[PDB]
């Protein structure tokens, strides 16, 4: 399935976030093993409670940094409370 990157940010949001329900597609063939340089991702958690769709949003850039930082380029975000699915 996914590459060893895909794998440490299934496993980061995983950890991080515990969601309900976690879906991470790479994409890296829509802009180009392609690199994993794009992801989708959809995330459903408890975390998002109360936060802005930016807040969200900046929160996995956040957690995801590292990554970002060394060839990981774009990463597409929907990211839901379970309430709100």
Known sequence: ???????????KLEKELD????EVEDVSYQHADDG???F??????????????V????????????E???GLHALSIVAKTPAEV
Request: net charge positive; hydrophobic share 35%.
């Open 55 to 66: 807040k969200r949003h900046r929160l996995i850039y956040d957690l995801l940094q590292d």
């Open 40 to 53: 989708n991702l959809r995330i459903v958690s408890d975390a998002f409670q109360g936060k802005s769709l």
């Open 36 to 38: 994993e340089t794009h």
């Open 19 to 22: 969601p309900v329900e976690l």
């Open 1 to 11: 399935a996914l590459g060893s990157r895909g794998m440490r940010i299934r496993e």
């Open 68 to 70: 970002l930082k060394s």
